[PDB]
């Protein structure tokens, strides 16, 4: 299945994933697409932070769903 | 149809809406439920800012979807 | 995280909180540390009153931030 990763700056990424893909496996694809390290990605879906160790199906992420990518930087 | 609204770390709340409801209409319902005025609300879905004039169907917001609410924070 | 609560007299107290702790949880911590009931407490950040049901991250209150306690 294919999903989308969207930034509020305008970037739209189309990824082929599986419902059992883990979040960290998705961030590895985003790094290939955008060059942002996984530790510096934060994905948001349904108003929730997508966490390591969980699958896309754990968050009810379905076909052609859109994940919100924000930049996660150590600060403060 | 019933949708959900939450901040990233807050409680999720339920809205009864129609696909033809405008984003301004949705923000007014959030004020009725949660007391947050519309001028202090930012709604995000599918990595897109929900603009007040558009409808929920303009963003393909469907049954049981969850909107990401972000507060508008200003000094004083 | 550690956050600071500043009274009108200038007293700073430190609380150990979580980002998703509610303002309600913060007023309860102030009571356990200073003996001030949450009913008398009014928490302010950047000049805004903080609502009981909201979390610290809802108001973008980072670590080592300072809330202002005003007694009601």
């Amino acid at each position, epitope marked *: 299945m294919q999903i989308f990763v969207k930034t509020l700056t305008g970037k739209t990424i189309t990824l082929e994933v599986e419902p059992s893909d883990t979040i960290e496996n998705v961030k590895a694809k985003i790094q290939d697409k955008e060059g942002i*390290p996984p530790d510096q990605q934060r994905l948001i879906f349904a108003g929730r932070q997508l966490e390591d160790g969980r699958t896309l199906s754990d968050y009810n992420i379905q076909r052609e769903s859109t994940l919100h990518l*924000v*930049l*996660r930087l150590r600060g*403060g | 149809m019933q949708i959900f609204v939450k901040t990233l770390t807050g409680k999720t709340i339920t809205l009864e809406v129609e696909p033809s409801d405008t984003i301004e209409n949705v923000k007014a319902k959030i004020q009725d439920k949660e007391g947050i005025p519309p001028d202090q609300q930012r709604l995000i879905f599918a990595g897109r800012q929900l603009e007040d004039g558009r409808t929920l169907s303009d963003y393909n917001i469907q049954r049981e979807s969850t909107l990401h609410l*972000v507060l508008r924070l200003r*000094g004083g | 995280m550690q956050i600071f609560v500043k009274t009108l007299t200038g007293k700073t107290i430190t609380l150990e909180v979580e980002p998703s702790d509610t303002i309600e949880n913060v007023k309860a911590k102030i009571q356990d540390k200073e003996g001030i009931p949450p009913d008398q407490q009014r928490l302010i950040f950047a000049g805004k009153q903080l609502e009981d049901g909201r979390t610290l*991250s809802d108001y*973008n209150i980072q670590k080592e931030s300072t809330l202002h306690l005003v007694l009601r």
Partner: nanobody
Amino acid sequence: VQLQESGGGLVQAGGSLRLSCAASGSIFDLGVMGWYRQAPGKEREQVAGIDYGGVTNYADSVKGRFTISRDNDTVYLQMNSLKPEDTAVYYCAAGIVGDEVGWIYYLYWGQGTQVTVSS
């Protein structure tokens, strides 16, 4: 609706630069604003941050040298005593905090401005 940096350039060691971050769509009302930089071969790293209350914080490598400030819809980064190690593309970003401590989720970021510091 975007952020957009300006003010970068080539400067001698010990020189000064003031970066400007212009925001559209009232996007600074997200509450948390920050400057970060990335040099070739290195990772992104936040250098300074400011929240909507005006409270600032800085990386250790720029304390006493950099100053972040704000004028409504413009965030600045006054850079003094610039060193060759400060050479990078500098980005301004705005966002929120989540359930983590010490990490910031930047929703928006600009295209960056190049700062080169040469001896």
